[PDB]
Amino acid sequence: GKIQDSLSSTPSALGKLQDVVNQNAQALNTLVKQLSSNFGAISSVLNDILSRLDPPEAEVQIDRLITGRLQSLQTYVTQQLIRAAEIRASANLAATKMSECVLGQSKRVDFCGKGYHLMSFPQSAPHGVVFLHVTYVPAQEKNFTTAPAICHDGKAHFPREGVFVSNGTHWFVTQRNFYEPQIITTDNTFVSGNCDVVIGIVNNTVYDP
């Protein structure tokens, strides 16, 4: 809902697509205006050059206009071909984003926006595509005690899930992304190597549930 309010009050928000339609309109307006140019010739008007000058000279002046107009057209075509490459690249990226964030769930970093990707929805648009990319962002970054492992019976215990944390009295394992602690238990740890292997290892209780 906030996006809809934003797009309504701030139309410039859609400028990336407005620019496409503006560039093509300008390319056409450019040819039409250049068409009236004489390109240094006696007259840019064909009926006028033919009635004004004896035919063999009018033909020379016509070749000057033809070259100038053909140059305007080649410039236009070149610009449209370069832009076609740019538009195709954007279309390829847009197609990629639809597949990656709408019809599947991509792990690409910040690909469809900052946050953890959750879901995405396409919209049609005048000569373009608009997507609403929905992501998660953490609400509050709280400070906890940590360790790479804790040990018991002289051996190092590592998480099979997430990260080992502490509140100052007990050790818990949370998710990599969120602070939802489990008491450390034997059933959810990996044991390998001596306690002394891990730098920063803490001596603590691993519970039997």
Ligand X SMILES: *[C@@H]1O[C@H](CO)[C@@H](O[C@@H]2O[C@H](CO)[C@@H](O)[C@H](O)[C@H]2NC(C)=O)[C@H](O)[C@H]1NC(C)=O
Ligand Y SMILES: *[C@@H]1O[C@H](CO)[C@@H](O)[C@H](O)[C@H]1NC(C)=O
**CB 201: neighbour CB atoms within 10 A?**
20
Neighbouring residues of 164: CB distance < 8 A, sequence distance ≥ 6 = 146, 147, 148, 149, 150, 158, 171, 172, 173, 184
* Least distance to ligand X, CB of residue 16, Å: 33
Task: Answer with the entry of ligand Y, ligand X, other proteins, none that 203 interacts with (C-beta below 5 to 8 A by kind).
Answer: ligand Y
CA distance 176 to 158: 13
Instruction: Note whether 200 binds ligand X by CB under 6 A.
Output: yes
Sole binder of other proteins in the list 11, 103, 104, 139 (CB under 8 A): 139
Q: List residues bridging with 150 in a β-sheet.
A: 157, 202
CA distance 203 to 6: 54
- Using CB under 6 A, list all residues that contact ligand Y: 151, 154, 194-196, 203
Closest CB to ligand Y among residues 54, 153: 153
Sole binder of ligand X in the list 22, 26, 167, 186 (CB under 6 A): 167
Task: Answer with the entry of other proteins, ligand X, ligand Y, none that 53 interacts with (C-beta below 5 to 8 A by kind).
Answer: none
Return residues touching ligand X (CB under 6 A).
143, 167-170, 183, 200
